[PDB]
Amino acid sequence: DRPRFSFSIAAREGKARTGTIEMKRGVIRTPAFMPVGTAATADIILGNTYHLMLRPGAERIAKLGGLHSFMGWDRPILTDSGGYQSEEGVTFMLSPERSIEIQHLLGSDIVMAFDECTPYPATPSRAASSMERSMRWAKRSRDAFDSRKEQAENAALFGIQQGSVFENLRQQSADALAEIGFDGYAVGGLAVGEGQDEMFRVLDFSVPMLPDDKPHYLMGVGKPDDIVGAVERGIDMFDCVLPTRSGRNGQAFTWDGPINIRNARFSEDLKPLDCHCAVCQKWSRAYIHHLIRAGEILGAMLMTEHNIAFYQQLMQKIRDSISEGRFSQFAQDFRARYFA
240 to 259, contacts with ligand 72C by CB under 6 A?
241
* Minimum distance of ligand 72C from residue 94's CB (angstroms): 11
Kindly state whether residue 117 participates in binding ligand 72C, applying the rule CB under 6 A. Answer: yes
| Size, binding site for ligand 72C by CB under 6 A | 19
Distance CA 311, CA 104 (A): 29
The DSSP string of 164-181 is TT-HHHHHHHHHHHHHH-
Distance CA 120, CA 102 (A): 28
State the sign of the Cα–Cα–Cα–Cα dihedral 207, 31, 34, 72.
Answer: negative
SS3 184: strand
- Closer CB to a copy of itself, 166 or 266, in the complex: 266
Kindly state whether residue 291 participates in binding a copy of itself, applying the rule CB under 8 A. Answer: yes
Q: Which stretch binds a copy of itself (CB under 8 A): 56-64, 117-125, 147-155, 314-322?
A: 56-64
User: Is there a catalytic annotation at residue 239?
Assistant: yes
Interface pattern 152-191 for a copy of itself (x via CB under 8 A)? ----------------------------------------
Kindly state whether residue 216 participates in binding Zn ion, applying the rule CB under 5 A. Answer: no
Q: E strands along 173-272, which residues?
A: 184-187, 216-218, 237-238, 251-254, 257-260
Element containing residue 6 per DSSP (H, E): strand 6-13
Distance CA 237, CA 30 (A): 7
Distance CA 180, CA 171 (A): 14
* Minimum distance of a copy of itself from residue 210's CB (angstroms): 34
State the sign of the Cα–Cα–Cα–Cα dihedral 105, 106, 109, 113.
Answer: negative
SS3 20: strand
**Closest CA relative to residue 215, chosen from 189, 241, 238, 243:** 238
Interface pattern 66-105 for ligand 72C (x via CB under 6 A)? --------------xx-xx---------------------
81 to 100, contacts with a copy of itself by CB under 8 A?
none
User: Is there a catalytic annotation at residue 1?
Assistant: no
Omega of the bond leading into 215 within 30 degrees of 0 (cis): no
- Closer CB to ligand 72C, 88 or 333, in the complex: 88
Kindly state whether residue 249 participates in binding a copy of itself, applying the rule CB under 8 A. Answer: no
Q: Which does 91 bind (CB under 5 to 8 A by kind): a copy of itself, Zn ion, ligand 72C, none?
A: none
292 to 311, contacts with a copy of itself by CB under 8 A?
293-294, 296-298, 300-302, 304
Task: Using the CB atoms, write b or e for 293-329: b if 16+ within 10 Å.
Answer: beeeeebbbbbbbbbbbbbbbbbebbbebbeeeebee
Catalytic residue among 43, 80, 226, 236: 80
How many helices (H) and strands (E) in the chain?
Answer: 14, 13
Catalytic residues: 80, 239
User: Contact residues for Zn ion (CB under 5 A)?
Assistant: 273, 275, 277, 279-280, 306
Q: Which spans of this chain sit near a copy of itself (rule: CB under 8 A)? A: 38-41, 51, 55-56, 60, 63-65, 70-72, 248, 267-268, 270, 282-284, 286-287, 290-291, 293-294, 296-298, 300-302, 304
Residues of each annotated binding site: 80-84, 115, 162, 189, 275, 277, 280, 306
Annotated binding-site members for substrate: 80-84, 115, 162, 189
